[PDB]
Ligand SMILES: CC(C)(COP(=O)(O)O)[C@@H](O)C(=O)NCCC(=O)NCCS
């Protein structure tokens with residue numbers, strides 16, 4: 001169970017909230033895979049290449065964290081890594097019942113596959129990607145909400 | 158972080174939902190402490206001594222699980238165990254925002270103390286101790302909702 | 315299924331919201347049983363006998379409606395009436411997830427027993443017995459919130 | 472009231488959850504109309520023709536259930552059938568207040584028109600069309616979630 | 629603080645609910661600016677020109693209310709008016725946590741900028757723009773839900 | 786409307802969240818009445834006299850703020866002050882729908898009486914008196930959650 005975890009996400013963009021979750025989850029698992037979704041259904045603000053580079057840059061200081069691009073079925077991705085744990089983040093604005101529904105769907109597709117929920121720190125408890133995209137989209141200062149080493153990337157495009 | 162986890166609760170009484178959380182959370186920590194709080198102010202149906210003895214019997218098969226009854230603040234109890242991770246369960250009828258608040262209250266009181274959330278099995282996602290207490294008080298069949306090694310007792314007193 | 319419906323409740327006291335549900339649900343079943351639960355553990359403001367007598371008077375105009383007071387599990391009461399359908403009301407302040415849970419708890423206890431939900435009228439969508447008890451305890455005007463054929467009583471004791 | 476009910480939906484696709492609701496509702500009403508919406512505002516995964524054929528196939532075993540295509544105002548559709556009852560389904564992931572708002576909107580447009588809520592069985596309480604579309608879209612196995620007689624249709628396109 | 633308030637919105641279209649909020653808020657502030665957003669992200673049913681004319685017509689009877697078109701960052705707009713108060717409306721169907729998140733985001737961008745929540749009247753508590761657009765889109769009667777002096781405009785296009 | 790505001794509460798005890806609401810709401814009204822309700826039926830931890838004396842000391846710096854203890858219906862108390870605006874606070878764990886209901890209940894009882902909602906500061910958005918009472922009862926450090934001018938007292942009795 002504790003050998004490997006997968007943290008799936010659009011990471012559009014990576015926020016301080018996401019970094020808290022990568023931090024706490026990487027401490028518990030011998031290896032954390034951060035799986036960067038295509039999300040085409042959602043038309044993301046940042047391209048996969050941008051979103052992979054932001055999260056790879058934001059996570060250089062974690063040695064057991066690997067970033068992969070992924071466009072498939074999470075249940076299948078976990079099986080190919082022999083992964084028994086999906087990492088998810090919970091925040092004030094979470095659709096909690098939707099999160100539970102997703103945990104039971106993923107476990108129906110892969111009977112080994114459990115879901116574990118982490119919280120960001122209190123200062124980040126009201127951060128959501130959607131806020132950050134709104135503040136970016138409206139040419140506001142998002143620099144307090146995202147790791148400083150990726151702000152140069154987001155602020156542009 | 159992986160050395161010790163604390164699963165705190167009133168456990169009035171321990172249900173099958175609680176057992177799924179102990180099962181799953183115990184696989185992630187070298188040692189799991191099940192911490193049964195007096196919870197005087199609540200007016201628990203079962204004495205603190207009955208509740209400890211019920212969970213003690215229901216967990217006897219889990220070799221790295223230890224049960225303790227405590228009178229104080231949970232945040233101080235974790236500091237005494239050098240415990241950095243609280244374990245909580247998430248269910249359909251959880252008060253999700255109150256769990257978040259209690260997570261941050263526990264952090265503000267012990268700055269090393271994160272909260273992590275597991276889910277019970279889908280069959281048990283609809284169990285609450287509060288349902289279980291109604292059925293017990295109206296002298297109904299709760300056999301299907303609690304571990305059988307305790308039902309000798311709740312069914313009686 | 316259409317032979318008999320049971321509308322269970324504490325009815326402490328019966329409100330205009332409850333009357334809309336009895337009105338609408340009684341049109342769908344050949345016979346509707348209004349089942350007033352003791353609900354000891356709750357600490358109802360009105361005695362079980364006062365609550366039965368209030369709903370009895372408030373429903374006397376509905377010819378296929380019958381009121382009964384019961385001490386036991388609702389699921390067993392429905393089995394005694396060969397009743398397959400529980401009637402419940404949905405309001406703005408309903409605990410929607412708890413209603414769902416209680417529906418499935420009632421099913422797990424009596425495998426023939428579905429729960430169906432009606433709505434009160436829009437004017438009454440904002441009434442709860444809990445509001446009504448606050449107004450009564452602070453000796454205020456609840457006349458607008460309950461059927462007048464009971465207000466002789468609640469207003470007094 | 473009990474003569475006819477209408478069960479409106481996109482049915483994109485029909486799930487085991489929808490079949491539970493058609494089952495329980497068809498038992499209460501002398502006739503159930505299943506009204507298959509265009510939903511163009513939502514760009515449905517399956518075409519009206521597919522969605523009409525799936526639900527007509529999934530409901531052959533109910534003799535008092537008719538399927539019609541419909542692109543209009545539910546309030547007007549109910550009036551043309553002299554229908555006094557809209558059937559809706561409630562699940563763990565429901566927007567409960569939105570469901571109430573829709574019941575009062577439909578009753579404002581047609582003062583005869585009441586809304587009644589059914590639950591699916593517990594095994595189906597976490598099924599939603601949106602889950603099923605996600606699992607389909609991601610080339611996952613949705614066969615446990617939809618009636619077997621329509622899986623051949625969905626799995627393709 | 630009490631000198632000026634800003635009431636931002638898409639107003640797609642202006643509802644009786646919005647007029648209640650403009651009414652109560654204009655009584656508290658020496659001046660209310662109603663800021664009509666582009667909302668392009670949302671593809672609004674009515675054009676900015678329509679939405680500015682509806683709200684300017686619906687508010688002629690309030691002498692301290694000004695309507696402006698606005699496409700920017702609310703935090704910056706408030707600073708240019710030296711405004712310390714964002715007016716927002718709360719209804720049964722509100723995403724309450726999202727409203728709180730937006731209040732803290734706007735205050736992070738402008739440390740002077742507080743958010744104040746008004747309620748519409750009870751008769752309007754279930755009105756939402758989204759309902760009104762649905763009833764319009766479905767060629768239903770929305771005349772009970774929007775000020776009569778703007779119905780001629782909406783009903784057309 | 787701007788002449789007088791009433792901020793009603795149990796204030797058991799007054800917290801830093803409450804102080805932010807008094808601070809912000811007092812800037813908007815010529816005079817703010819902090820109305821401490823007996824709330825017998827609740828079983829407040831602090832006597833009505835202790836609660837008045839705590840808020841009295843915590844507000845002594847606010848020159849237009851006056852504290853009063855009352856036994857009756859709030860709606861009648863506002864009528865006695867010729868008060869048209871109730872002030873309430875909104876927090877992460879607020880029961881948002883119950884606040885709305887109580888707003889409309891207060892209106893139906895006093896037809897001139899609107900309710901307005903403020904937010905505390907982000908640091909205090911996660912405080913509830915209920916958290917504070919748990920910490921006090923388990924004899925823990927609540928110093929960080931209440932105004933220090935009261936902590937002489939709560940910490941003791
Ligand atoms: C008992 C519990 C873990 C909650 O458990 P429950 O939800 O099973 O009742 C919580 O109330 C607790 O920690 N109680 C011990 C005393 C304490 O620390 N209270 C302050 C909480 S911030």
Ligand SMILES: CC(C)(COP(=O)(O)O)[C@@H](O)C(=O)NCCC(=O)NCCS
Nearest residue numbers: 291322323324351386387388389419420
């Ligand atoms: C009284 C009620 C119908 C709920 O009614 P209420 O919401 O009006 O209090 C429910 O508590 C009930 O069924 N009580 C009787 C005993 C019972 O069956 N309890 C177990 C519920 S699964």
Ligand SMILES: CC(C)(COP(=O)(O)O)[C@@H](O)C(=O)NCCC(=O)NCCS
Nearest residue numbers: 448793794795822857858859860890891
């Ligand atoms: C005390 C309160 C303001 C709510 O405050 P709280 O949420 O801090 O307990 C409310 O219960 C109240 O107004 N109580 C006084 C009596 C009353 O008017 N009750 C009827 C409410 S419609």
